Amino acid sequence: SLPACPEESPLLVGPMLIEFNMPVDLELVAKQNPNVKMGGRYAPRDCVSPHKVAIIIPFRNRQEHLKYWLYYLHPVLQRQQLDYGIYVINQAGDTIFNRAKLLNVGFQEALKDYDYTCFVFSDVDLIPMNDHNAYRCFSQPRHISVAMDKFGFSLPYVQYFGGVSALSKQQFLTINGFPNNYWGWGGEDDDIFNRLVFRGMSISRPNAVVGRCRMIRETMLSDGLNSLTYQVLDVQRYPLYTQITVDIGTP
Amino acid sequence: SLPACPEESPLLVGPMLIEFNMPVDLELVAKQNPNVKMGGRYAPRDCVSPHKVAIIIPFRNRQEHLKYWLYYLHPVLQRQQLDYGIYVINQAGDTIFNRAKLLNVGFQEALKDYDYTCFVFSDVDLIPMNDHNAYRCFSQPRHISVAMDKFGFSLPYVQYFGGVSALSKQQFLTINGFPNNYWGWGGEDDDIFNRLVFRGMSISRPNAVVGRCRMIRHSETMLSDGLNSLTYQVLDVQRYPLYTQITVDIGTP
């Protein structure tokens, strides 16, 4: 019935100022984005998007950062004319953090809501400075956070495929998702760039200016999606996001 | 007879001023480094170095840049107490450039002079700003150019394992060297990161400050495409005081 959305959205505004010297009230953010449905779900009214994107945020005790993330990304994602939903994967307990495992949980859980075909894995503390940085999938795995605010050496904050990146369902399934046994922060050695290589994939990215983000301030075949185990303890449908609280075990 | 050189050389000075305004005369540079022998060869007089390093530069019509590279790196390499030689691999003709294939030639040709055990592959237009950045090999593949001088975003110039990197002879042979069929400038698409992964190796590097480099300016297929399938024709070999230049025909796409 509806027409397909254009290939490039005409609603983009380009670079935007990101400042964190202003308190955020999510009740106001919700009234500013009234087309977002309960649970953080949105689709264009005027056209059909081919981008069915689940944005997955690994999370634990970062509510202030999340307020800023929602305040800044909901307008961006709509301007990009995406058919998206927001899934916050909250790691229950005080175990060592396991980013990769939570991303696997988010993939499995988001698919219970809707047949997403693209998955954006995003740290809660990275805001894109230009809405030309598409939050969706490409013919190759996509690295969305390319460089940081002040355009310095960026590998510490984003590694090769960290910070914000995107994988289609097929790309995610080809590598059997992320590993589940990397507890803690391992740097550019725990980057799953290795998994993309084994399956003959490379990295796509925008240019470093469009890709700027600002900060709020083998074993593969057996360790991954097919061996994932976890227990969901809570699911909360807030106006602007879904939060899933899970027990992912211990190292 | 001689003692082993220390693990860290006592001659290191740390950060360095790098400027590209003074014209360079290689006859004067040779008089500044009188211990460098014909062909750009040096070994310490006072100790035996465990680092037998061939520095291989893929090259074509960049003589001005090459002057600066020699002016700045010969002092650095000597201070690092290395047993090294300088090999410039000049691609004959003005065909489309093939960085990776030239690197394979340099590895094969350097070994005809001397039994090097470490190979540093360095773009001619990258100068290290700190002599603590070791131009030699490690237990894992080594990425020497980590970050750029000022605007630190470095991925376009260094990729994952480009710019300046080092592979021991064993590490190089394990991945069957570099590919030979990547014609042109491919960026991080021509990067051999996949080959290191395929063989269960990772990247070692210094921290981004020690690893800072400045750019000269004024502004499956692995097992079958590599060293074992390399073909080329040497057209000239010239032995200058400060470097060996090998001019080769590496064919066309």
Numbering used by the authors:
A (entry chain B): 126 to 342, 364 to 397
B (entry chain A): 126 to 344, 364 to 397
From the publication, what sentences describe this entry?
Beta-1,4-galactosyltransferase 1 (B4GalT1; EC 2.4.1.38) is a family 7 glycosyltransferase residing in the trans Golgi.
The closed structure shows two molecules per asymmetric unit, with no significant conformation difference between the two chains. In the closed structure, we observe that loop1 is displaced deeper towards the catalytic pocket than in the open one, with an RMSD ≈ 6–10 Å. Specifically, the one-turn α-helix usually formed by residues 274–277 in the open conformation becomes a β-turn in the closed conformation (arrow a) and residues 280–284 transform from a random coil in the open conformation to a one-turn α-helix in the closed conformation (arrow b). Between them reside hydrophobic contacts, which mostly maintain the dimerization interface: residues from loop1 (Val271, Gly277, Phe278 and Tyr285) and close to the Trp loop (Phe318, Val322 and Phe323).
